């Protein structure tokens, strides 16, 4: 065929019932994740090719960066709760990997303050049970697919993207291949 299992994607031996349609995992500590967001804009180009009526989900993971990795999973929960993903994603990536000015939860908090979320509103969110369950959600979804690596994308809890098996000579062509694969898997 043109899309082969084991080539542009792999199939989960253990399919995850009721999973989000398109489910992406990253870490702010993850170097290909930084590329995926800043240079490739993967999430965005996938959305641009997905049919109508398909929700897109993105979760942070704990297994990179120890105590600070977990702080970032909580902050991402806060970001999702306040709907400010698009305002903190870049400063979090650059604060962790570029400038390395993020070394503690207070430094993560600074990013939200400088993006305009109010101190009060961030701390309230940070400490809220709505954020506790959002952290629980992120952990459960990663657990459901026994996740040991990021970036990772899963379609309908059955198929996992395999970027390793796509040409990387041209970044634009890589992105389209990637997105077209998601759309193919989506219509499977």
Q: What is the CATH number of the domain that holds 113?
A: 3.40.30.10
Print the domain residue range for 88: 1-188
Q: How far apart, in whole angstroms, are the C-alpha atoms of residue 153 and residue 165?
A: 14
Name the maximum alpha-carbon separation found in the chain: 55
| Residue bearing tokens 């400010």 | 84
Distance of CA 87 to the CA centre of its chain: 15
Q: Resolution limit in angstroms?
A: 2.1
Elucidated via? X-ray
> How many domains is the chain built from?
1
Q: Taking the CB of residue 123, how many other CB atoms lie within 10 A of it? A: 13
| Contact (Cβ atoms closer than 8 angstroms) between residue 163 and residue 46 | no
Q: How far apart, in whole angstroms, are the C-alpha atoms of residue 75 and residue 73?
A: 5
Q: How far apart, in whole angstroms, are the C-alpha atoms of residue 186 and residue 46?
A: 11
């Amino acid at each position: 065929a043109q899309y082969e299992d084991g080539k542009q994607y792999t199939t989960l031996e253990k399919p995850v019932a009721g999973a989000p349609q398109v489910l992406e995992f990253f870490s702010f500590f993850c170097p290909h994740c930084y590329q995926f967001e800043e240079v490739l804009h993967i999430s965005d180009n996938v959305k641009k090719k997905l049919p109508e009526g398909v929700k897109m989900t993105k979760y942070h993971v704990n297994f990179m960066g120890g105590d600070l990795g977990k702080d970032l999973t909580q902050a991402w929960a806060v970001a999702m709760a306040l709907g400010v993903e698009d305002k903190v994603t870049v400063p979090l990536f650059e604060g962790v990997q570029k400038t390395q000015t993020i070394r503690s939860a207070s430094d993560i908090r600074d990013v939200f303050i400088n993006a305009g979320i109010k101190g009060e509103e961030y701390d309230a969110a940070w400490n809220s049970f709505v954020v506790k369950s959002l952290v629980a959600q992120q952990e459960k979804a990663a657990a459901d697919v026994q996740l040991r690596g990021v970036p990772a994308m899963f379609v309908n809890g059955k198929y996992q993207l395999n970027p390793q098996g796509m040409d990387t000579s041209n970044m634009d062509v890589f992105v389209q291949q990637y997105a077209d694969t998601v759309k193919y898997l989506s219509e499977k």
